[PDB]
Structures are given as structure tokens and as C-alpha cells.
Amino acid sequence: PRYLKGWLEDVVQLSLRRPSVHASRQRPIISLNERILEFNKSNITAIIAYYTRKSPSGLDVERDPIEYAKFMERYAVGLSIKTEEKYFNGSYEMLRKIASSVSIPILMNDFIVKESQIDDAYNLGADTVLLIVKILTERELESLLEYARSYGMEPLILINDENDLDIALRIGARFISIFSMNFETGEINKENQRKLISMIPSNVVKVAKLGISERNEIEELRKLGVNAFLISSSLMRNPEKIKELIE
Numbered sequence: 001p002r003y004l005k006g007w008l009e010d011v012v013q014l015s016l017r018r019p020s021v022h023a024s025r026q027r028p029i030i031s032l033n034e035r036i037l038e039f040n041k042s043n044i045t046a047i048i049a050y051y052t053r054k055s056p057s058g059l060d061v062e063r064d065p066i067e068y069a070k071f072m073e074r075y076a077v078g079l080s081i082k083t084e085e086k087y088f089n090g091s092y093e094m095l096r097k098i099a100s101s102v103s104i105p106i107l108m109n110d111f112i113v114k115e116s117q118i119d120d121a122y123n124l125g126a127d128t129v130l131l132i133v134k135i136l137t138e139r140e141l142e143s144l145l146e147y148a149r150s151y152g153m154e155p156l157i158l159i160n161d162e163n164d165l166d167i168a169l170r171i172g173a174r175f176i177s178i179f180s181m182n183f184e185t186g187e188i189n190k191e192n193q194r195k196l197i198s199m200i201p202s203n204v205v206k207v208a209k210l211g212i213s214e215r216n217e218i219e220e221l222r223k224l225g226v227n228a229f230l231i232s233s234s235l236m237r238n239p240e241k242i243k244e245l246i247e
């Protein structure tokens, strides 16, 4: 990985030591990017629901992950499951249980820094993985994208700025999540997010992290060409709100 500081350095070093899982995948690869395009065609707002046991906002909500997943199976284009253990209190066992419980695409949301974590995702039933430009060398990012693709998974590449986009496009990214977030405050700079979106080629499937989890923000971004939306963990408090967000 890149050299990093603070808790991010800690979690990346912890992730390098993540024990691998020996398991047989229990389900097909259910492509997230393709389902997004299908929703676009059908004119259905495509929202990726996000589950994390512990939220960085400090407002943790008690929600049974299986109940949440089964509810979201009816509305969401896919699920993002935070599997990092130390700070977010996720687990591989939770991912496995969720994957065995629903038939919609599952994104393994973790700090992916080695090949065995992609093996883990595949073996556990995840349909794709997040790769984060800001924690990986370009060589690592390219190699991990290739490794995920070898499995039949199109990784979601997280970009935060123009530098990240330049690297992502060079290494062949076709499925990109646009944050443009101040890491220190957890706040999206909507102006910068929109500039980044405008720089992305038309043949890339685009997922925006919502800075404001409301229908107005979604409508504005969809007009700018965004294909799907990663919503806040706050939706765990009232899952039903996703009905409003989707129309």
C-alpha cells in the first residue's frame, strides 16, 4: 500500500494481516454494475444501500443485518457491507450470512490491499469489491483490478480527486465511485464532486456518494450522468426512507 498516517495507516496495516477464508462460494456472481445499467434502462433510481455495524458519524444504529438486507432486497440495486473489523465492527461471517440470505448484488466494502481479500470476497459470496486509489500504489491498483476481473467481478474504484481519476482511468477502471470527501470531516464537497463527474468518460459506470441523502440531490446528480448512488449509513435508522428516494 501507499505510506499513510493515523488510523488509516493502522487499518491498512491490520488489513494486510487479515486472515484468509477457506470456503466454497454458495451463489452466482450477481453483477452490480450490470444491474445498475438495467435499473437505468427501466428508469428506476439505483441506490446502493450501505450497512455498517459502527458508523463514523458516531451515531450507531442497532439494525439486524439480515433483516436490513432482506428489506433492501426489495428496493436497492445492491448492498454495500462494511467488513472491516477493528473500527467498523464488521465480519466475514456477517457477509457470508447476508450473501446466503439475499439474491441482489453485494459489494464487500473493506480496505482491500492484498489478493487474498479478493479471494475472501469471492469465497464468501460477495459480487464485487471496493478498491481505493488513495491507499494503493498504481501498480497494486492495476494488479488488484486485474485479479478481481479474473474472478468475473468488476471492482468499484473509489476516487476522491482528479489525481485519483487519472490513475483509475489509466489502469482501466470502468466502474467508479465518486466521493470528493474531506476525509477529516467526512463531508462531501458537492462542487468538486460534480466537477469530477464531468471529467469521467461516458463508458464508465458512475456511482456517487450522496453528501445529502435526499431526492433533490439525487435528481441533480442523475441529470449530470450519475448512474447510481451510495447512500449514507444513516438509512439504517429508517430503512423505509429508500422508498421516497427511489420515487
Ligand SMILES: *C(C)CC(=O)c1ccc2cc(OC)ccc2c1
Binding pocket: 008, 082, 084, 109, 110, 111, 130, 132, 134, 158, 160, 183
Ligand atoms: C471503508 C472500507 C472505507 C473507508 O472508511 C474510508 C476511509 C478513509 C478513506 C480515505 C480516502 O482518501 C484519503 C479514500 C477512501 C477512504 C475510505
